[PDB]
Amino acid sequence: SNIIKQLEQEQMKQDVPSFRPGDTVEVKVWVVEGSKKRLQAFEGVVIAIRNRGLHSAFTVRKISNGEGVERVFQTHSPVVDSISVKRRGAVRKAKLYYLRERTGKAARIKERLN
């Protein structure tokens, strides 16, 4: 698959920041509303990262004014404009799906700081 490997890496964006699950992340996303092309922000804990080159996703979980939301993002989509890491987070797993069962003080991730 040098054809496919050569063909996908022509599309991979270069400046994707290094983040790992547990991190609070603001993701800025192009949202189109008719003619105006707005850019809105989705901040939450990374609970899952799939690395597959171009087909790399990451799931961000927010508790939005009420109930909880999980956006899975394709990392190399042109929709996903910015990824910035707000708070670096210290966890032990690789997929943090237990946090789907926890709210508030139980869903509280220590900071990494190294």
């Binding site: 054809i3 496919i4 171009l54 190399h76 042109p78 929709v79």
Partner: protein
């Protein structure tokens, strides 16, 4: 028009500029090179026989090698044949490239599908399973009844029963061609085409309107 013989390289996606992922299948279409031209005056129908790829010298037999040697062409991995469309003209030894699809806008892709072996009627024919409990005695995935009673006292032809699913010619129609890349010899069509990776495809222009 005619088609070209490809090879299923696999699947990827193509992010558009406005952020719409398109699932594409990559089909490497090398130089299909014409080995025989068929006319009404000798065969009753106008068609070209092309070959593609390359074969080992010791693995091609003497009949086959004599055929490609007459054509004045390198031996490929197979011979295929395309029916011609009344105003088209090809010569023997002429090479045909993916550039032919630089106008076509939508194609039909024909391959052999993935062989699923002896399949039961729930996989094969989408029969619905009977109860998984409530008394049922050894008949969960079985086909049920297969016909009527004394009248007819036979099972009709083409009753859907279990047997070999997969591994047969299927044509997927009206796939949007996303890119034609004459440099790398590639054709990116939108969607899934039949076959496992590396399987030989046949990409023609779409006959539907």
């Amino acid at each position: 028009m005619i088609g070209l013989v490809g090879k299923k390289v696999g699947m990827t996606r193509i992010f558009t500029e406005d952020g719409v992922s398109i699932p594409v299948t990559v089909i490497e279409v090398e130089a299909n090179r014409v080995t025989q031209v068929k006319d009404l005056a000798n065969d009753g129908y106008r068609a070209i026989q092309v070959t593609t790829g390359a074969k080992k010298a010791n693995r091609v037999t003497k009949p086959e090698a004599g055929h490609f040697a007459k054509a004045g062409v390198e031996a490929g991995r197979g011979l295929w044949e395309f029916r011609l469309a009344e105003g088209e003209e090809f010569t023997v030894g002429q090479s045909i490239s993916v550039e032919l699809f630089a106008d076509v806008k939508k194609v039909d892709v024909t391959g052999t599908s993935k062989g699923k072996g002896f399949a039961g009627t729930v996989k094969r024919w989408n029969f619905r399973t009977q109860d998984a409990t409530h008394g049922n005695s050894l008949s969960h995935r079985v086909p049920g009844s297969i016909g009527q009673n004394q009248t007819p006292g036979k099972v009709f032809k083409g009753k859907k029963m279990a047997g070999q699913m997969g591994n047969e010619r299927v044509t997927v129609q009206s796939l949007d061609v996303v890119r034609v890349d004459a440099e790398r010899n590639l054709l990116l069509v939108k969607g899934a085409v039949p076959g496992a990776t590396g399987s030989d495809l046949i990409v023609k222009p779409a006959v539907k309107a």
